[PDB]
């Protein structure tokens, strides 16, 4: 019957609460940006391998395009 002034210890909102209380609620995950992000993008860990991958990427296509040049290539 105390619903008129339901303050006796504290106010009640339980019927409007369909979930729990145990922990705090973060709006979103700024980590999601962090896993999406790689800090070391200026220096990827791809040493000599990607040199060959770009080396075999069709110099002839690029030569037909704009007269490509790698290492003295005529």
């Amino acid at each position: 019957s105390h619903q008129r002034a339901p303050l006796g210890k504290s106010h009640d909102q339980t019927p409007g609460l369909p979930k729990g209380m145990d922990v705090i609620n973060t709006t979103l995950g700024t980590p999601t940006i962090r896993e999406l992000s790689v800090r070391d993008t200026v220096n990827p860990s791809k040493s000599f391998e990607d040199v060959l991958k770009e080396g075999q990427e069709g110099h002839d296509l690029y030569t037909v395009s704009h007269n490509d040049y790698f290492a003295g290539e005529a």
């Binding site: 993008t41 200026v42 220096n43 860990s45 040493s47």
Partner: protein
């Protein structure tokens, strides 16, 4: 053999150095434990320019860590590379900063300068012959400016024959957080001008804009800023450590870089920046690098030199390039804006080509600039200084410490002399 010993100063330089050294180790491929894994001959031979030998193939960094607050030093000690740093190099004090320039410069410095001088000279005697030194700190830093001004003054007379490289970040123009910072800055720069020979200028706002522009990543960390500047710091230091038809000595560079003694303030410039899809949308060609390294948005130091002109320009190119393209880009940019340089000097460009690329990026470069783009920086602080000195705000501490208004009078006057000197050289 000519080597370098590093100093990490201020609490910012503490984060900066922690980032800076691990970049060096990962570049050279030493594990966090410190046991180098032999993979590259060239980095094996030329690691001694910075590191010394410890037992068991351990390359001890030659850096001395100085601060006042333990927690910052404990944090960097607890880092993934805190082990590779030395407790011998961890010198500090039992006092809190207060972010006061004078306490560190006169009160807290007095009992610490004795110890740090011993450590560096022991480090100086440990090695044979330096090129010079480099310093990581901030000009507006509470403690770093205090000791930074002290140390540079002391280390001038013992060895006045070496390189006084400095790396200081300029605070944010919109807000300085610290409110007595312009006092600290004006104090620091007064001693900086006569005691330095080279200065690096860095601003976080531009770094914040870089994240919005090319990184496009919304929320970075402060450490997400640190590897950015260290990569530029590493890049300028790659030239010494690596072979290639390019002259490495800073004295090669500085004499080509400094026409007049008062020109110490120099600005960084860095090469390809890439976004989410443009890793696979970029044709890595020397023109578009030269285009991008010479972008108005690509300057990160203070602001756009568009208001002014270019005094001296020097860029180091890292990767597999050739002598001719650097020339014809140099011709292209020379023709692109012939009038925007100063008539005072033609051919104001100094180019270096490091044949050894980064360990995962091939076409790369680093740029160091001297334009007429510093005037607004110290004009900005000029109204800051005059207005607060107009009614001597926050003055009771420094008088309580023992500082007086006269010190400020010549400090601004020297800055005023610098104002015209930059103006009268260009305008």
């Amino acid at each position: 053999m000519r080597e370098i010993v590093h100093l990490q100063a201020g609490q910012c330089g503490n984060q900066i150095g922690a980032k800076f050294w691990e970049v060096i180790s990962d570049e050279h491929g030493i594990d966090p434990t410190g046991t180098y894994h032999g993979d590259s001959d060239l980095q094996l031979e030329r690691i001694n320019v910075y590191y010394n030998e410890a037992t068991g193939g351990k390359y001890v960094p030659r850096a001395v860590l100085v601060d006042l607050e333990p927690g910052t030093m404990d944090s960097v000690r607890s880092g993934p590379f805190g082990q590779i740093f030395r407790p011998d190099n961890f010198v500090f004090g039992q006092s809190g900063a207060g972010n006061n320039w004078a306490k560190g410069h006169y009160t807290e410095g007095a009992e610490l300068v004795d110890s740090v001088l011993d450590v560096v000279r022991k480090e100086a005697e440990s090695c044979d012959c330096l090129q010079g030194f480099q310093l990581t700190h901030s000009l507006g830093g509470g403690t770093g400016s205090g000791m930074g001004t002290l140390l540079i003054s002391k280390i001038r007379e013992e060895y006045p024959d070496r390189i006084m490289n400095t790396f200081s970040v300029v605070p944010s123009p919109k807000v300085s957080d610290t409110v007595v910072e312009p006092y600290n800055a004006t104090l620091s720069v007064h001693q900086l001008v006569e005691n330095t020979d080279e200065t690096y200028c860095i601003d976080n706002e531009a770094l914040y804009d870089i994240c919005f522009r090319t990184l496009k990543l919304t929320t970075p960390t402060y450490g997400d800023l640190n590897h950015l500047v260290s990569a530029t710091m590493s890049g300028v230091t790659t030239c010494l450590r690596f072979p290639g038809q390019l002259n490495a000595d800073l004295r090669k560079l500085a004499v080509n870089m400094v026409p007049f003694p008062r020109l110490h303030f120099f600005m960084p410039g860095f090469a390809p920046l890439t976004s989410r899809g443009s890793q696979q949308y970029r044709a890595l060609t020397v023109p578009e690098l030269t285009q991008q390294m010479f972008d108005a948005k690509n300057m990160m130091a203070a602001c756009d030199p568009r208001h002014g002109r270019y005094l001296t320009v020097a860029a180091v190119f890292r990767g597999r390039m050739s002598m001719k393209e650097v020339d014809e880009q140099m011709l292209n940019v020379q023709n692109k804006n012939s009038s925007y340089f100063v008539e005072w000097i033609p051919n104001n460009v100094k180019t270096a080509v490091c044949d050894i690329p980064p360990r995962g990026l091939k076409m790369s470069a680093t740029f160091i600039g001297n334009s007429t783009a510093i005037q607004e920086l110290f004009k900005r602080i000029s109204e800051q200084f005059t207005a607060m000195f107009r009614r001597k705000a926050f003055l009771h501490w420094y008088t309580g410490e023992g500082m007086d208004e006269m010190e400020f009078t010549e400090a601004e006057s020297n800055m005023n002399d610098l104002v015209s000197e930059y103006q009268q050289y260009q305008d």
